[model samples]
Target: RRQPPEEVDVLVVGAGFSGLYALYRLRELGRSVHVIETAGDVGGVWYWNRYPGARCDIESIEYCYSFSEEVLQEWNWTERYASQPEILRYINFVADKFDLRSGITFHTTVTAAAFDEATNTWTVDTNHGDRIRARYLIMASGQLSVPQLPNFPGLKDFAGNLYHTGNWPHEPVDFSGQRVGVIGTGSSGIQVSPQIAKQAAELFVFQRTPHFAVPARNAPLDPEFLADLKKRYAEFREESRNTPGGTHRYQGPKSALEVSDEELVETLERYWQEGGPDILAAYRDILRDRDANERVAEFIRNKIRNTVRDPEVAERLVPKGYPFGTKRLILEIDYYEMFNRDNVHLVDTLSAPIETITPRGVRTSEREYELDSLVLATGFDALTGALFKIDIRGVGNVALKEKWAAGPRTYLGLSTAGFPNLFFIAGPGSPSALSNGLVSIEQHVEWVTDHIAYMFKNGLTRSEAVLEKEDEWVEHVNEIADETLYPMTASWYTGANVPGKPRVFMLYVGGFHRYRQICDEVAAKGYEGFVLT
Candidate 1:
């Protein structure tokens, strides 16, 4: 039985960067807000992803929030690429600085949320047997929060301990002399494998698909550089808002195909030398043109070959099927080079599939590898996973999972049809993960908050996306994606990672600037495509 209901003006989900900021903004608006998080504290993705070498790909300077100049001026990031712990510390600092802890309910998971059409309010149910009613429901659930664990045969039969990169143990586990086996070569696997190789006696990496990774070139932030960045903070923030993907740096102008071979080579080399997450974005046409993408892909493959001592291993590690920037590009420090380590071994699962998990380790069709600990760096269910995991119902008790059984469909990635007073921050059908997540989160939160305030001021009871409008938005999202090379690949961006899942492209390929403009236009046009009462 659920506990007695509590009432509030707003109910925000998740405690990640988005939810934290949303709560902070609502408090500023003087609206009564309640937040719920599954984690014991803040730092959504970072809280769970405590793998060996986890770090943010975006530079610390651009990745953080610019909503408060005071926060920006006071806190200084220690490194160019912030590690997981440093990022978590920053999240805690934000929570403390803004006094957001009181507004949030920690160690609580939202199990179900439904709209009461007659009352024009959202009734949210949680795992703690608590019921909460709010005028507005904000799904601040992050894009990558739901970890994907593959159902490999006989997984429970393995005697060795198992660890998932997405849900690492709170306490540190010593891998000093223990043999470790890592599965999946996604961003997390690529990041953790090299670090585990350095610590473990023997490391076995199982690769189903090859990944393209560049050197992170991480370093401590110089004081002089930090000072200069702080001086131009306002300009940088404004520039990021106006930019294509809401990121201040990597504002390269020329398309990959427009430049000559020599010029392209020079440009790629320059970005590669600079070494960060923006390397792929350096070329404007990388996501649009196929030939240009192949050029960059070949270049990275050549770099992998140059780094790895064994040509066979290098060949096996280089991604072949997809375009270079279709999936998330991984930034690593000596990742390919680590494959040359005597302790590290690579197993190609595509050729020889894992038959079963033995008492000691993983057994493949070709051979059996012995290991003490098994780490699965397999990625997330992405955009719709967190939302669908809960029993979200809308008009007439219609389940969100059933509605989106074919695939997720939404208007502006904010509201779905029949789901009144519900909004998603950086949700599907938007440039969520494709753009700077913090920027997208802030934009969505501000938009939703303002909309809620508008409704209150106008004496409106409810507002939601019309079904026709949702269909149009879905088509528009697909049209924009069809113009790019993103839809041509099998990536989580298209919900292809999950078996039996519909193969529809999820994000809005229209740049962040364009998306913001569209939202503004909709607001100006009396919130066109939305029904308000």
Candidate 2:
């Protein structure tokens, strides 16, 4: 058994991509830093999300880190889209390469943390009964870390094996000859169902609302191209950083409405064939104009209809009511085609509505479908959920959870008004879930660490967002969110998945490139809109 140090310059609360980078960067800045992770090992999300067919939506090459040239040259990805196992292995490689685990305490959770006004330090208490004092508390905890289970009656009474996609068992689960039921049709459902179809005797997918999904069209990576890219890896990463999506996706210049019907079909058809979620940036006004979004949405809807054999089943699969790209876009591998299997069935919960869970299976208004096993693909509480779990208190012992009960508020999504010397890396208010996760995580970690470095350089003991600036930033975040189609949807982007959570838009819809520039400008102005004492 290992114990945490009683004191340090910074105490990070995760060991994922963000926290690992934070530790590395802090060491480079010559600061004493320690990390605490709830998982038994590293690979925060990957460690937990071990469901069937689990993989990243982002391409493997683009999803990785660009912090070290040596790393970029040494490591090579096998597939265009990396599976969960491969991604987990990549994370382990990084951890070993940097010796990141030495500074980390595993299988430990932070129970509470309160800021001391007089000392300008935080006294953090953990489940392990360790009290650690640190000048800075960096929450490198993730956006979609918390899983939300569906609240159905008799859920605990279900006699069969039950699983939640977010928290799958580490051991291999056998489904051969067993009937399986899956709830929800978000990204996880879309990815896992196809794999389950191969093994289960029968598969019943209970979809509440159909989400827009594009073809992953994943393929093996070409080694020659990988070698070529590595030669100019840094320059290529710079190009990605300059783009809006934080990927090398080509930004279409024309509005979706501006193109003729034939041209729109031709352009979108090409994108559909090329495959991937880059189609989100295929038009300038796709997310801005309702008419423009509809045209593109119709094209995708038609594609879905053509993919499934039965017209009725295909129609049910086609997403309606909400604009495309508003909800989280999914990349599917034979998700639609899986419907062709005679044993695979689709249960439309929106029309029939789930009544409750019985001892044997799930019951809807129409009928009770018996199952040997069940998987809840229900999504996350998202953005602020992980933070709310921690008992974080600022000046005067103001609870962070209560302060952000209605919604999250912050300046640049980094620091809050009353919370001094505390930083949230890649949390709410920034281009977090909206952009490439690794890109946003790297940006947030670097910026927060740099800010901490600046504080040390100037011998500042306390740092907090000016209340007025925090207000303005929250307002600005909402204003931009209102401009896009994002706020219009009832997706987790607005915390709709979690009952009683705020209905406010949580992420900055602004492009990552612009957000990066704004952050640079703020730091260039000696960390504007913040108070450092």
| Local distance difference test scores for all models | 0.85, 0.89
After superposition, candidate 1 runs with Cα above 4 Å error: 1-5, 147-150, 251-255, 258-260, 492-504
For model 2 the TM-score comes to: 0.96
> Over the stretch 128-165, how does candidate 1's per-residue lDDT look in tens digits?
78889998999888887655455688778888889888
Compare the candidates by lDDT and give the number of the best one.
2
1-533 in candidate 2: lDDT tens per residue? 36899889999999989999999999999999999999899998888888988889888889999998888998989999999999999999999999989999999999999988878899999998999999999999887765544467788999999998988888889899999999989988999999999999999999998889999999999999999999999998888898777889998999888878999999999999999888988889999999999999999999988989999999999888888887557899999999999999999999999899999899999999999999988677756778878899888889998888667888999999999999998888898887788888999989999999999999888999999998899889988888888877654353344675544568888899999999999999999999989
> Roughly what TM-score does model 1 have, to 2 decimal places?
0.94
Query: How well does candidate 1 match the true structure, expressed as C-alpha RMSD?
Result: 2.7
lDDT of 2: 0.89
